[PDB]
């Protein structure tokens, strides 16, 4: 072991069958008033996701491969895995039923006979009391054993199924196509559903075993009454199956409706920096409110039928028995003299066992659709590393007339591709936005669908993507990627990528936290980190997807001359490019167009055959609470919309119902104390009719109260969620930067499952229990008020026990809820990088971390239920001992105590006891469960808030955007409130109608002049004004729409391109077509049947960045803002299209004030003025002509060094 004793799996002597191992933790629970992480007794090797998972996998694979897998019914999840553990429960249920039935029924009759004439004997009670004690002890022990077995056996199934699902998730999928938000919802919600169905769905078998016993007892006491019970039970059978059939469809529709809502919830989380400038927070709010309203309506419709089956009529049996008694009544019956109320009380006690059937049937019906869903997840294509084609030696990559394109129902893009690569050679492709030299790179990975051709490959890859993927670990761990530390190789890597000043500028040291996805670094730094990791990993084959795009000229030249030329000269490097500056030193160049290779060979041969591109080459052109749950959460919960009125109506209805049932009980009790037939006999029929109509009322009343309660609780939940969403949406940027996303999404997946499912039932049950107890104590105080002595000791000991167990219950629940968020964080952050993870073949480490996190989360689940079972056992034992003592008292005190004042003693007692036993358990249950509302309230207004959309008090005149005067003055920022300054002493004065180009060294600042305008930075020093009007005083909502920005990284939401094009439908139909046509996409849209309703998702995955950039250009063209700024709009674009692009930009915004950003000097030479910055400061600047004839100018030096 060496970790924890875990006394469950040993100590076979009389120490572990009863719940006694938890007495050790009860001391520590109240000694410190807490329970930390070091004394939780983590799970042993028995309940570990390493032994059961293998067995489940083997069983499922065998059941798949035995015959053709058409559907397989997924019967092996439940019926064959947890089978042997259910036979013991189903065989102990019969024992406990018989023990609870046979004993008391005869004992009460014998005690009544003894209280009739005690004067006969005195020692005849000892056998009776001994039998009573034996039966009670046997019953309680059997019940505790059954619950313990089911609780223990309900965990392993979920523990194995979760890891099976994740292991299936980690596979090569060409596209998601699964509404990614669904996958997370599959991991959490369906985890819970597979648990309850294994721990509750086992008491359904307890119905018939007692029904047959009741029928045979009735036929043995009365002759011809053995036929009506069977007839009235046959009619009861199909109602349950009808209920299940009706609820299955409702559950399926509800889960389908809630599938989509959580997907749109993820889109804002990972794109908040994008939709924070165009005030697109309005459409999404309306869309999510509409889908939430639809979900709430269907949930209410589903739940209305349930409230009618929480025991609307378990009195069918008593109604049938009363009808049989009244109809057959021959005015005396010649048999009913002493045991009149005994049989009625026994039959009333029968409802306790069968009151739990609806819960079992509902859980089974839900588990059916859960099984269907999990079956739907499997039976999909495992397309990865399958080619089934021969290879050849002395080569690494070989192709033979491949014909590939994105997704099986789309027009082919590549046809008849054939190429070869020699070992240790450098090859460049080059081309346009046509042939698409990104499908070729991904073809050999295995992510590309295949139709024909032949692909062969043998080796290892160090993949680099066009974008960047950065984990949450520290920088040194990111560079190492799970490798052994070194000193010489690490220093060589750091010196070979020109990374030294970047590491020196860090505040503390190299070891620093990065973030969720490298949100604290620029694009160039992320590219450099990815390149350094690929360089240090030391793999056989290097694949670079344009690693020299966003970076400058000098650093790129140095890296190519130092790293690629020398440090990587002993391996094979294959990379594509759009710039022909470095193609001189390359070995071979292969040119392909429109998916077809035209000419290939030595680069020196591409001079006279076709000088197409040569014209370009010619010259220049959390925290866990440490206290008890206060009443503030309850006050907030009841202060929801329509709270007090609904609560008062519900309480009044409940009080009236309890009064009615009390009056009926008194009526039947009085009727019991009457003549034994053959006297005063017509009134019986009238009384039966009165009783029948009374029941009716109660029923009607119970239906009404259920309806009202369901409506009120659902309204409260909807209002709470609607309040929460706006607060999360207006969260400042720093909160999103520090706190990971897995800490926010949890409150939207797990809390909403428990608040809207389990809470109302427990609340209503506790309310009913407390009103019944108060009525019983009032009645006891009413008649026979001379017995009010034991009440004090009873209440004080019960309070002592409750205050003893509540500490453990609360601490265990809090520790259970705390440790579930890193789970979701990891499962979210390990999906987006499927390509890189598959390339590096690093699934095992992620899987092991997943398993360890799952076990840590599952550790405190068992003890939470074990504590409640232990409390129930203690309460039952105490009550049994007290009633035994009171009965023995009776026994002894049977000579000089009249029976008139003692006949009802055992009666009222058993009720009182039972009522207290139920009350304590219900109170503990609700106190445990009411922590989710507090957890949601943890994000109350104490959290930071974004900035005030507007103000509506000092809005500027509508004619404000007239001049583009900008006056920068001392703009110094920190970006983290702790990090050192990134830009210092920035002051500019730009006259209206001016053009300025941006170019400079990597790192440093570029984009440098971003922020401090449309700013959300919490400016501390300096201030700027636009057109003579300050920026701090004016509101944000109006100001953000005045100017427009084209982001460097394209962003494309789901739905359609139109919705992005018009946030509010303020443009006609021809203007958008003209805008799309003007930028040379005449055939880029008409190629599809949809014209303006294109299906775009997942950041435009159909067409690559070459088209996403121009889509964003077209979108920003129609806005026509006062100031339109382009942030490096020529990242990956050809040279021929450049002119057209800049010509269109100049034609459109001829007089607008703009600041152009580009990575190429030759494409910025036309600007009126230029400026450059070295590290954090701007050097002297003027027109390009002035600085061109200046040897001592950095701009001329870098232009000359650009070659
Ligand atoms: N989101 C961020 N959070 C915190 N610090 C940041 C963030 N972005 C940049 N920095 C830091 O601010 C300083 C200036 O970087 P800046 O963003 O201006 O670079 P850049 O000009 O965009 O770079 P590149 O040319 O590589 O794209 C650097 O120290 C950088 O690490
Ligand atoms: N991420 C994607 N997922 C699915 N299909 C894609 C994706 N990107 C592009 N497509 C489809 O495949 C075709 C080929 O585009 P490809 O990705 O090869 O472009 P590219 O030339 O490399 O891009 P760029 O010029 O923007 O750098 C597109 O016209 C489109 O039909
Ligand atoms: Mg690419
Ligand atoms: Mg930038």
Numbering used by the authors: 94 to 500, 572 to 785, 834 to 893, 909 to 1430
What is written in the article reporting this PDB entry?
Human multidrug resistance protein 5 (hMRP5) effluxes anticancer and antivirus drugs, driving multidrug resistance. To uncover the mechanism of hMRP5, we determine six distinct cryo-EM structures, revealing an autoinhibitory N-terminal peptide that must dissociate to permit subsequent substrate recruitment. Human MRP5 was demonstrated to play a critical function in regulating cellular cyclic GMP (cGMP) homeostasis, which is essential for many physiological processes, including the maintenance of vascular smooth muscle tone and cardiac contractility. hMRP5 also influences signaling transduction pathways and may contribute to drug resistance in anticancer and antivirus therapy. From a clinical oncology perspective, hMRP5 can directly contribute to cancer drug resistance through the efflux of many anticancer drugs, such as methotrexate, cisplatin, purine analogs, pyrimidine analogs, doxorubicin, and antifolates from cells.
To capture the nucleotide-bound form of hMRP5, we mutated the catalytic glutamate E1355 within the Walker B motif to a glutamine (EQ). This glutamine substitution reduces ATP hydrolysis while maintaining ATP binding capability. The E1355Q mutant was purified from the HEK293F cell line and incubated with 6 mM ATP-Mg2+ for 1 h prior to vitrification for cryo-EM imaging. Further data processing yielded a cryo-EM map of nucleotide-bound hMRP5 at an overall resolution of 3.5 Å. The two NBDs were bridged by two ATP molecules in a typical “head-to-tail” configuration. Importantly, the curvature of the transmembrane helices formed an elongated cavity across the TM region with a large volume ~4540 Å3 open to the extracellular side. Thus, the ATP-bound structure likely represents a post-substrate extrusion state. Notably, the unique kink in the middle of TM5 disappeared as TM5 became a straight helix, reminiscent of the kinked TM4 and TM10 of ABCB143, which were re-arranged to a straighter conformation during the apo to ATP-bound transition.
